[PDB]
Structure formats: C-alpha cells, structure tokens
Design a protein around this ligand. Sequence first.
Ligand SMILES: CC(=O)N[C@H]1[C@H]([C@H](O)[C@H](O)CO)O[C@](O)(C(=O)O)C[C@@H]1O
Ligand SMILES: CC(=O)N[C@H]1[C@H]([C@H](O)[C@H](O)CO)O[C@](O)(C(=O)O)C[C@@H]1O
Ligand SMILES: CC(=O)N[C@H]1[C@H]([C@H](O)[C@H](O)CO)O[C@](O)(C(=O)O)C[C@@H]1O
Ligand SMILES: CC(=O)N[C@H]1[C@H]([C@H](O)[C@H](O)CO)O[C@](O)(C(=O)O)C[C@@H]1O
Ligand SMILES: [Mg+2]
Ligand SMILES: [Mg+2]
Ligand SMILES: [Mg+2]
Ligand SMILES: [Mg+2]
Lengths: 164, 164, 164, 164
Amino acid sequence: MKEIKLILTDIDGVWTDGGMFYDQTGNEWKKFNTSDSAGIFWAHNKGIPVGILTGEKTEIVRRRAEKLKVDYLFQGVVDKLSAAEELCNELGINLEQVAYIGDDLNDAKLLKRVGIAGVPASAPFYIRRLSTIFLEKRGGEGVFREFVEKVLGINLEDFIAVIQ
Amino acid sequence: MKEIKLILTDIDGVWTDGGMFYDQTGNEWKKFNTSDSAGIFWAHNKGIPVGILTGEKTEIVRRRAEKLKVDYLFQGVVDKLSAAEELCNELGINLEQVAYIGDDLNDAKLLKRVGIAGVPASAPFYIRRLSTIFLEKRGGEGVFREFVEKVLGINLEDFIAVIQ
Amino acid sequence: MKEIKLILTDIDGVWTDGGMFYDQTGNEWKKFNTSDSAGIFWAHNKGIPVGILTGEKTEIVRRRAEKLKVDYLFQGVVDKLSAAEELCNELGINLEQVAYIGDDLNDAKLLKRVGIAGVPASAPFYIRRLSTIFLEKRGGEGVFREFVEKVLGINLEDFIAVIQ
Amino acid sequence: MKEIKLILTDIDGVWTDGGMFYDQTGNEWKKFNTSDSAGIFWAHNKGIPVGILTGEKTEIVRRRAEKLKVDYLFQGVVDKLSAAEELCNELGINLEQVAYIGDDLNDAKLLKRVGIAGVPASAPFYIRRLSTIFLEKRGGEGVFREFVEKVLGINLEDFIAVIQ
Ligand SMILES: CC(=O)N[C@H]1[C@H]([C@H](O)[C@H](O)CO)O[C@](O)(C(=O)O)C[C@@H]1O
Ligand SMILES: CC(=O)N[C@H]1[C@H]([C@H](O)[C@H](O)CO)O[C@](O)(C(=O)O)C[C@@H]1O
Ligand SMILES: CC(=O)N[C@H]1[C@H]([C@H](O)[C@H](O)CO)O[C@](O)(C(=O)O)C[C@@H]1O
Ligand SMILES: CC(=O)N[C@H]1[C@H]([C@H](O)[C@H](O)CO)O[C@](O)(C(=O)O)C[C@@H]1O
Ligand SMILES: [Mg+2]
Ligand SMILES: [Mg+2]
Ligand SMILES: [Mg+2]
Ligand SMILES: [Mg+2]
C-alpha cells in the first residue's frame, strides 16, 4: 500500500473508548489496551517513528507514552494540522507520507490532509467518512494496532518471521 | 425540528452507563465519554445554554461540568420538573422550548412536559417510551452528543463549516 | 407471580459484571449500576425487604448497601442456603416465599430451594439453567432491577401510579 | 480430552480484556473477573496445579495470584517458552502435558509447543489461529474459566457432584 514515513495518533477515542474517569479528589484515569503496544512494535520493526498528538494534557498519557517508547508526544495541542506540518518540516517529509488516526472534530483538518487517514468504527459519522481505510475496531479495542498493521501491510509472513 | 432555547440533561445513565465505582476508602468514580463534550460545542455554537439536573451531588460532577463549561449545574435535585420550570422562568422561556434527556424514574415527570424528550437506548422501557425522538446510543456511549445533534439538526454542512 | 415476602441477592456477577479492580496499593473497586437502586425502590414500594448475601467482605459493599437502604447485609457468607434459612427463620418466612438471584457455584444450593430463582444472562450455563424465570440482562447491566420487576410483577400501571 | 498435568496462563488479555488503567499519580489497575476463580477451583479439584506466566510485573497480579491460590507466579518473563520448559523440567513433565492460554505475540512460541493451546476470541487473528480448541469468550469475560472447563472436560455431572 501507500508508502508511510511517520505514524501519528490521537489518544482519547482511539487508544481508549473515550472514557474519562473522574473521582472525588481531582484524580483522573484513562483505560488503555495492551494490544495497542503491538502497533508501536510493528512500526519500530519497520523503522517508522510514532507520534502522539493530543488536545488533553495529563500525566496519564506521559506515562503511557513512556511505557510504550513512543517517539514523540505533543500534549495540549490546539491545532493538530499545524503541529503535524511542523513535525513534517523537522523530518523532511510531506503530509502525503503520514498516516494519522483520530476520531473527532479536532482531528478533521489533519485527517483530510494526510496520505492515509484512519478513524475507528466508534467515531461520529462525519469523521468516520474521512477515513481512507476501513477499520473494524472501536476506540480502546486495539484499533491503533489495527491501523498500524493495515498501514504497514503486516501479513502472516511478517508474524512468522518475528516468532522464530 | 422544534425551536429549542435550552438543553437540559441528567448525568447517571446518560453521560455514563449508570456505573458508580466504589473503592474501600469512601471514594467514588464515574466514567464520562469525551464524545459528549461535542454536545456542548454544538449547543454553544448555536447560542443555546446547557444545564445539568442530577439527584446525586458529587465533586465528580462539579469537576466534569466545569471542564465542559456547562452553563448551569444543579445537584441534589429532588424535583427535576420544578427545577426546570424555575430555570425557565428565570430565562423567560417555557418548557415547550426545552429539550431534556434522562433515563429513569426521577426524570419521567420532566420528560413528559418538555418540547423534545430524549431517552437513551439503555433505559427502562417505561422511560424509553416517553422519548419523543429516537436515540440509538446507550448511556455513556455519546448519547448526549447524539441528542444535541438531533435536537439542533446538526448536519454535514454544519460540520464542514466548523472545520474550515 | 407467586407470593414473595423477601428478595435476596448476591453481589459479584449480579450487581456487577463480575469485575474486581485491583491497584498497586491494596485498594479494590467494584462498579455498580445506578439502575439497580430501582430494584430496592420497587421492593420497598411493595413492602418487601431486600437482603444481600455475599461471600466477599468489603467496605465497598457495606457502603453501597447503606446508600441503597438495603434491609439486610451479610458478608463473608460461606453457606448461603444456611444463611438464608436462618434469616428467614427470624422473619417467619418459608424459602418458597423467597426470590433469590445469584450467578455462580456458591449460589446453586440456595437457587435450587427458593420460590423464584433468578440468574443473569452472563452466568455459567450450569447455574443459568437453575433460573426459574428468564432474565435478559447480564451482571452489572441492571439485572437486579430486572429480577425485582419480574418477581413483583411491576407493570406500566405501577409506573403510572408512582409518577402521577 | 488429552492428559494435562499443568495449566499455565497469561494475564493481560486473558484474565482481563487487555485494559490497563493509569491515573495521574503513577498508580495502575487491572480489572479481573470473579468468574475466572472457578478455573482454579476446577483445576485444584482435579489435582492439577496452575501457573501464571506474564511479561508485566505488578503488585496487582501478586495480589490476584494470592487471592486465587495460584500455585506458580512468574512475572517479568521475557521468554515464556523457556520459562515453561524450565518449570516442566522441574516438575518432571513435558510440554505435551501442558495446557496454555495466551493472546499475543509474546505467547506464540509457547502456544505452538503445548499439548493444548487456548486463545481468547478477542485476540489477534494470527494468534487465535494457534488455538487448538475453540474458545467463545473474550479476554476478561471468564475465558480462563472456559479454557479450564474445556481442557478438563467439566460436565454437568461434575457440577452436580460439587453442589451436593
Ligand atoms: C514484548 C512486549 O510486547 N511488551 C509490551 C507489553 C506486553 O504486551 C505485556 O507484557 C503483556 O502482558 O505491554 C506493555 O508493557 C504495555 O502495554 O504496557 C508494553 C510492551 O511494549
Ligand atoms: C476542542 C475540544 O473539543 N475540546 C474538548 C476536549 C477534547 O475532546 C479532547 O482534548 C480530546 O483529546 O475534551 C474535553 O477536554 C473533555 O471531554 O474532557 C472537553 C473539551 O471541550
Ligand atoms: C430517586 C432515586 O432513584 N434515588 C437513587 C439514586 C438515583 O438513581 C440517582 O440520584 C440518579 O442520578 O441513585 C442512588 O443514589 C445510587 O444508585 O447511588 C440510590 C438512590 O436510591
Ligand atoms: C467459594 C469461592 O469460589 N470463592 C471465590 C470467590 C467468590 O467467587 C466470591 O466470593 C463471590 O462473591 O471469588 C474470589 O474471592 C475472587 O474472585 O476474588 C476467589 C474465591 O476463590
Ligand atoms: Mg479523540
Ligand atoms: Mg439517570
Ligand atoms: Mg456472584
Ligand atoms: Mg496477553
């Protein structure tokens, strides 16, 4: 499929089902899926970097990005298209060489500009229709992994090669 | 769609799937869905205030309401119809100009009196039948967003206009 | 529906989906569903007490029981049939006048001896086949409410009566 | 079913749906399903030890292993096949007498070598195809219980015998 040099991803509604847990004390949680770490694995296996673009800003996400050895983390991003363009500048690539997955309004402008756009099955219809590949999985169900595997054309042969 | 001047909403079973998480220490959680924040976005985009009426009283909900810039928050409400009527008086509107979404016994009197009544798909059947519009989504699945988008007639053109 | 004078219930797998959340510090959580409180409402409306029999013993459940004004709470119960017999003996009640809902091995002896036995849709097949009424809901989905409404014959007329 | 002398299991994605909950303070949760404890019950009832092999290392799992009286607990395992072979050598059994359930890349080598391999319905397709028995349940839904019951041929007669 289309050649990709950078994989970018939103968090809420992609790495999660959109859930934001609040308690009585000011603490907050997100629920990640260990399945998604394999998306980082396949990307790094093919020598492709992964960056997170999120509108939120939390220690939750910083620690998760650390655990998964994500290459870039941008939090509190107000303009994701600008952020992506700037990062493309740094790497000497075009948006045409980027695969991005997001699920909501703040992702729309960037989704429309990238080489491959992914949107989970759980997303609003007017975002889902921006997706250029079909994703079966919902947010939090391992849809980041699904996206990476499809974008990179990971097949049974690739699997067999890594489990020797 | 009927003219609407105020959107009101329950929390438990609408903004959540009814889940109430308890630990061993007296703390408590709810799980919100980031998708519902777009309900506030659309309402405010159309100049319409949003109010929360809940029979619970928690810091959980105080914090979530603040995060989403909800216009009105009423907690520990014992009589939601009276509460809605009083707010209408203060605003110079009548219940026929209100859209309300709720899911259970304490919402029924108000559901029967508003201009547009919404009830999530997850709700008890005797409450569900009070709904005057069909909602596909369950509590916690983004059903508040679904309600707002339906009530305000948010369409593709409206979406295209905001992502420019 | 036959005459019922006491409604008894398990917690894990009935009031919850079986979920037991553990953290890194020795704390523990359960997720309840606010829908189930209506089960207590209907029982009390009909003048029927509710008791909890659970094999676990937690502050989680003590607090939840208090919040819902449950009439009886017995925790750390090893022999649920004996516990039920002893409670009923204090109240003058025959097991045939009891409705009990449970979901697992420790509930089977009691389920086989009560007037109405309920088992959630999510339960192991060997237990589900002991249910004497059909319950559509899974643990944590409001199946306690479902059980009470069916056992007490709660219909649209009862609903109309409480909201008028 | 074939002769089994040891049951081994992964945690994340088998005993859970893969969920990893992070808060703002460095704490972490997993959500277990009480249903899975019956897996240990049946195994011990047939005189068969159970061991956990997991690549994570948490107090969460120490606590859950203790609660369920699991015979062996190995965490931070990087090579599950080697760990299993070493354990087998110690017990004087071979891999053909082991039943193992896992869901992801780190489980594949061992799944290919055991006497009975189980993989939950929620797992990646290239792992699921390694399963030698059909499992209907997803991670966190009681799939460890399902695996044990199938591996040990637990039938209605067994159930009847234990509830007398
Ligand atoms: C070899 C491997 O893939 N390690 C991955 C593990 C396993 O999925 C986990 O140990 C299963 O139990 O998950 C992480 O720790 C995680 O999602 O938190 C990230 C890590 O990159
Ligand atoms: C521009 C915008 O829509 N901001 C909304 C964000 C994004 O949905 C989030 O940043 C996605 O990562 O969610 C909130 O913070 C929230 O649900 O907590 C409310 C806020 O109004
Ligand atoms: C009138 C009524 O139903 N009160 C019930 C409420 C409402 O369901 C809740 O206020 C909705 O927001 O829930 C509880 O507080 C609860 O489940 O914790 C129990 C209580 O008996
Ligand atoms: C007799 C029995 O099987 N006890 C099991 C209980 C019951 O399932 C529970 O008490 C239901 O309320 O679950 C555990 O405590 C657990 O999953 O934490 C393990 C324990 O082995
Ligand atoms: Mg998002
Ligand atoms: Mg409600
Ligand atoms: Mg139970
Ligand atoms: Mg796993």
